[PDB]
Amino acid sequence: PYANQPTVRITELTDENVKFIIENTDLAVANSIRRVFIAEVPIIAIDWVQIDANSSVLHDEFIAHRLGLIPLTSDDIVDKLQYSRDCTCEEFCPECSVEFTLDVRCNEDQTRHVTSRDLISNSPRVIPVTSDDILIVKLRKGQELRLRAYAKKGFGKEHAKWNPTAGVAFEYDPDNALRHTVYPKPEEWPKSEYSELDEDESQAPYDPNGKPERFYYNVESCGSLRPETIVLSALSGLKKKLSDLQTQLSHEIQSDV
Amino acid sequence: MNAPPAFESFLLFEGEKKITINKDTKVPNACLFTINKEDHTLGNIIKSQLLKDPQVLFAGYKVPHPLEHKIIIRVQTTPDYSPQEAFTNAITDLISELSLLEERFRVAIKDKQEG
Amino acid sequence: QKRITTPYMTKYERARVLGTRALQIAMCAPVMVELEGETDPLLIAMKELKARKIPIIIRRYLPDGSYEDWGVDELIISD
Amino acid sequence: EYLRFRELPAGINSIVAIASYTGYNQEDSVIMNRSAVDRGFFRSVFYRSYKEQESKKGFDQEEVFEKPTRETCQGMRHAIYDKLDDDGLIAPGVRVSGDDVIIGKTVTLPTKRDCSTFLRTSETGIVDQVMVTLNQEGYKFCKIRVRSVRIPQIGDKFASRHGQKGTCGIQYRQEDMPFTCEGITPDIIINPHAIPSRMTIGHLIECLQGKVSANKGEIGDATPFNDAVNVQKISNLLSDYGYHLRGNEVLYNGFTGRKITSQIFIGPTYYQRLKHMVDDKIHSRARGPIQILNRQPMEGRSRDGGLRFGEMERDCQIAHGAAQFLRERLFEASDPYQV
Amino acid sequence: SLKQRLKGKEGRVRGNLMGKRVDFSARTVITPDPNLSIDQVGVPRSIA
Amino acid sequence: DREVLRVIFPTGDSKVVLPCNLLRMIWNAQKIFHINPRLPSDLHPIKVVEGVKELSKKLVIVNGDDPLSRQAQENATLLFNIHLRSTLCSRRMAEEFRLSGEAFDWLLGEIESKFNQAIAHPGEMVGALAAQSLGEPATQMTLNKNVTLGVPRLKELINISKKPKTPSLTVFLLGQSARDAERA
Amino acid sequence: KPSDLHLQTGYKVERHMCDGDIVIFNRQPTLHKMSMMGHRVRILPWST
Amino acid sequence: MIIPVRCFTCGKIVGNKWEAYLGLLQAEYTEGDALDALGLKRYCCRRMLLAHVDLIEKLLNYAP
Amino acid sequence: SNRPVMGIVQDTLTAVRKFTKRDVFLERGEVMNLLMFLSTWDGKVPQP
Amino acid sequence: MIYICGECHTENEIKSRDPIRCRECGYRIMYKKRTKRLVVFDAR
Amino acid sequence: LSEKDVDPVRTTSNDIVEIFTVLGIEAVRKALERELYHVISFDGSYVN
Ligand SMILES: [Zn+2]
Ligand SMILES: [Zn+2]
Ligand SMILES: [Zn+2]
Structure with a gap:
């Protein structure tokens, strides 16, 4: 002792x-x-991005890298969430991940700023911290970004x-x-x-x-x-x-x- | 091309022991603890806690290779004390300190938040 | 008898004797030494060399065209 | 200002500590911060374009874009032809690895041979663009851009602007890196032994001036023959921001948290990622194809060639006395033949 | 001609007999490893 | 042996390259056998003389009892034997090294063991060794009274040339001219 | 098919290079004997 | 091309500060004052915005 | 040149000079850490 | 086999036999459309 | 060498060819060794 x-x-x-x-x-x-x-x-961060449409000047995994770095609210839900590796479900489920959506089209002459405020989660407990907002990409008229992302539990020893x-x-x-x-x-x-x-x-x-x-x-x-x-x-x-x-x-x- | 998965530094692959104990034949009452998927985090606190035990003659750890994820802890105790017993007591002392630290930090937050 | 070459085994003879004996062991040749948990043919050849049991004769060719046959056991190993 | 370098920069400002940390930056090697790299630090894209042209020339010989069936076409390889679309062209957004077919080209046999384009073995990217058009000769012309993201690895070259190039010897996470009292960890650690012989004092001044620039909020001026800028002047400015006037800081070992006995010179320095990446240079040969004239291993990494065992290596092995190994390299491992 | 093929550094004799390209060889960048022995070489898994 | 050395090294440079480090071997013997330099030694001076004589016969470079082999054997180890005799002499073994009988017997064994290990191995490609040994330094030589040196001079020696770049002639004066500037 | 995977004495298995494998490791230009030295292979997880 | 989301050194979020940083410079703020106003105290974070080049603005000029 | 061809280099050589200075003193914990990296260590801690 | 025109951005269906050329403006540089197969990106 | 008051024992030429034609093959053997030793040892380098 x-x-x-x-x-x-x-x-x-x-x-x-x-x-x-x-x-x-x-x-x-x-x-x-x-x-x-x-x-x-x-904490909970985006670790799985599936891009349906990306007409922006940034390539697909450029966008995904930015989405992973966007901080998400994790204060109490992180303890409840299981590690997707530990979870007994399929690839993902509500008990080990949070689903995110992003669907932005620019049709105005003014530049459209795709920010973290355009990320919509399926769970209110896990949202981007900013909701200024973090800029994901800037869209020109006629450009669109349509993607769905899953945020999962993890710690800095794996990824920053x-x-x-x-x-x-x-x-x-x-x-x-x-x-x-x-x-x-x-x-x-x-x-x-x-x-x-x-x-x-x-x-x-x-x-x-x-x-x-x-x-x-x-x-x-x-x-x-x-x-x-x-x-x-x-x-x-x-x-x-x-x-x-x-x-x-x-x-x-x-x-x- | 040869990048290991990031999770490989803290997840044990199937059939891997988290910790193994090997007796040190060079000197008596000395054991080598090989802990898998651990780094300087646990190696340093365990080593420093062991050095606080008066019955521990030698306490030291090393990461043999930064690209590997093993720590080797060498503990030597007195003849009446076992290295394994020193290791268990060291962890309990660390757990007690951390649990006490958690309680006293929660009180500090409440006092600070209250006023 | 009547040997003028060195009584020591040269580093080049050691390298080839060990390599040649290892291949023989790797090809299921009988092992002259008793092995305990040794499965590498090259390590087994090292044990035989230390035990002076390698059944190989080194034939050292002299510049004049003659040769001297030395048994591996006869030569002095560096170790 | 006149090189448009601001408009098209070729580097990143890096918190560089000149320290002997773990021996992994010795001999012009560099320690990189793994956490910084996880945040896009020196992340780069490699774009490679493949152009293929279908040309009909001859009485009945022509080339077309199509998916070559293993039965219909004569030539064939162990690669994968499933990615190709019906028109013989891979589609954008498809992941492609080594030994993948991006262009399905078949030349009619005088049934038809396979001239399909195989993606570079090392390359593992995503089809970015697939452009089809008519080239200058009027033939159907396809260019395919494959996009691969290159995260800085061990072995990637990095240089300051002072001739101090070096590959990454290891990457440590943020907690493993040494930190200042403020929690700042260096993005890059270079060995102190690179400075003395090279005498790249401009590197040290840039680091000192970079620290003042970042704290002051002003881009520093490093124009060569400028008496208005001196090390003493820069040092005096740095003191005003609560730092040691010579750019040193007390760093704590990241593994133990103990203060390092020597204070470490640390500050912002502009580094640049060099084109030379290890994954483009790593090459292994184990019984590959042989060339027609000499029946010896092919030449070149892109051809899976063998390394040359030249006269100097041959001379070296003679001095070693390794006659059998010399025979392996020059006879058994190159072109064993019987007559 | 035939004479050109045999002479020189890249000729038949010096370029293909005294030296030649070999199988079972690997090449890549070298980086420090103070945790290896002087007689050890750290090798990528892809080469191995 | 002293006079023979004077002929071999007229310049008086005593630094030589020899197989076995006798001074360090003696130092090892002193530590191994805990020789006390203060106390008198139990090593008979004659054992030193006889022991060295027996050792010299064991260090054989040119085996054979015929006069031609004996002379070559004497010549091959002349320098080492002179060094051995002037180091393992009875006066010095009793005055400074103070080795005991046990230590001296061990010392003789080490010299024989280390000397035999120094003998060149048959099959050694010494020509290739010499070429690399004289070629590797060339990679660090510079290129250009003045006298040619470095790589350009090395070429003149191996490319032996009728006309050297900087021919020269070092003349030594014989009589009083050497010590008189006016007469020189 | 495991029947063809069955091994018997006299067969050769071309196995992957593993830890402890002896290799010659060379830096050009090969100027002297130490330019080519033998090394024991250690497998580490990167490309250098 | 675009402002990094996090500071490379410490991981502080800086991708929500580029527009604010530009606005402050529009308000006659000095670069040092604007960085202070945004809370970027560590010179690692000040490095992020002080040395950023917004090329995405140029890229938006090219029609998709 | 009948001498070693490899020796101690940049960091180890600079540090070993500092290490072997007369006024370098190591605490019990520091010493035990260093002995962990001594493969030939007999396991006996010397008298300070 | 839809093709986006490099100038007027018009999706065009071109077979393996008909010439490659924009239906509307006749532009000769076409681009394949993004594959319907969805690739998964780790946000790392 | 024939000149009076000139030492005919130590007077030497750095020209190898001159030594050979005046003194012989063994003299040039020694002279060649000394001249080669001069270039090697000029910068303090040592070769066995
Ligand atoms: Zn689940
Ligand atoms: Zn920061
Ligand atoms: Zn069009």
């Missing part, structure tokens, strides 16, 4: 970012947490479109008391926003017994999940990976004996 006893302080919480501090953790746990924010927090973060700022030891980074000329380096030093001194005095214990986070959200949901989803997902691992380890230990 040598578990840490982390404490959490949330400094800033908006609709886009959550700023918080974790204290009394190992650097490995703090790094694995940010590393799960990016790669192992599931399932990464829910727009930048995870991670920091520790802002005053470099541990000297994990050695400045050739410390006076030349800007103070961290979390620096507690005075203007006169550039580095905190070296701490021989110090260890990384306090970690600063700024988890910005793409929009698919609330920033606080990304953190909670990461903490439960990381716990799930460990609990799943221990179940396998228990079998291996039992199997050997």
